Design a binder for this molecule. Structure first.
Ligand SMILES: Nc1nc2c(ncn2[C@@H]2O[C@H](COP(=O)(O)OP(=O)(O)O)[C@@H](O)[C@H]2O)c(=O)[nH]1
Length: 194
C-alpha cells in the first residue's frame, strides 16, 4: 500500500487551481482565468518513481478551497500521515506570510505532521523586491518557528509553466513522501487487509 496524503492549502487568490492542473499535466489552449474551489475535494497523483527497478507512489491530494468556510470549520482534515504544501502568493511580498500565519489554527491545534514546502506562485507578476521580502519574512517567521514545526523549505514557482518551476516540487514532495514514517512505519508501502 504505497499511498500517502497531501494537503494543498492557501488563501484564495494564491493560484492553487493552475498549479495543480499544470502538475497533473494539463497544458495550453485552455482557460487561463481558472475558477476557485469550494469544498474540500481529493484526487489521485500516481507519480512514477525510478531506480534500477521501477517503483511508484500515489498520493491522496486534498484540494482545499482558500476560503474560511472550508478551513476554520473543518479541523478534521489534519493528519500525521500527510504532507503539507502551502500555496503562497509572491505578488503581495511579505504580506502574504502574515496572511498565511493564522493557518496554525488547524495545523497546530490538531496534531499534524510533516509540512514540507511553500510554493511561491505569481512569480511571473511579482517583483524581485517582493520575492526577497517574501523569503526574508518566510524565513524570519515560519522557517524559524511558526509556532509548530513549520521549519522546512520553499520554492518560488512560475506555476503557470512546468519546466523546473514544477519539476522541483514534484521531486521535493515525492522524496519526502517516499521516506516518511509514522510510528516508524513507512507510510508509502504498508501491509493492509483489503
Ligand atoms: N499570472 C499567474 N496567474 C496564476 C498563477 N497561478 C494561478 N493563477 C491565477 O489563479 C486563479 C484561480 O484562483 P485560486 O486561488 O486557484 O482559487 P482557490 O482554489 O480558492 O485557491 C486563476 O484565475 C489565475 O488567474 C501564477 O502563478 N501566475
Amino acid at each position: 500500500y504505497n499511498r500517502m496524503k497531501l494537503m494543498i492549502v492557501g488563501n484564495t487568490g494564491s493560484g492553487k487551481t493552475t498549479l495543480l492542473q499544470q502538475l497533473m499535466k494539463t497544458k495550453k489552449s485552455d482557460l487561463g482565468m481558472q475558477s476557485a474551489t469550494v469544498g474540500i475535494d481529493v484526487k489521485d497523483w500516481p507519480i512514477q518513481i525510478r531506480d534500477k527497478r521501477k517503483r511508484d507512489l500515489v498520493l491522496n491530494v486534498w484540494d482545499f478551497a482558500g476560503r474560511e468556510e472550508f478551513y476554520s470549520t473543518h479541523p478534521h482534515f489534519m493528519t500525521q500521515r500527510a504532507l503539507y504544501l502551502a500555496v503562497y502568493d509572491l505578488s503581495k511580498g511579505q504580506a502574504e506570510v502574515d496572511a498565511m500565519k493564522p493557518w496554525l489554527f488547524n495545523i497546530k491545534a490538531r496534531a499534524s505532521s510533516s509540512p514540507v514546502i511553500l510554493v511561491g506562485t505569481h512569480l511571473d507578476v511579482s517583483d524581485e523586491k517582493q520575492r526577497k521580502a517574501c523569503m526574508s519574512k518566510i524565513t524570519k517567521e515560519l522557517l524559524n518557528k511558526r509556532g509548530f514545526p513549520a521549519i522546512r523549505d520553499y520554492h518560488f514557482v512560475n506555476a503557470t509553466e512546468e519546466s523546473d518551476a514544477l519539476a522541483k516540487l514534484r521531486k521535493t514532495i515525492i522524496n519526502e513522501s517516499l521516506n516518511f514514517k509514522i510510528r516508524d512505519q513507512l507510510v508509502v508501502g504498508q501491509l493492509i487487509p483489503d
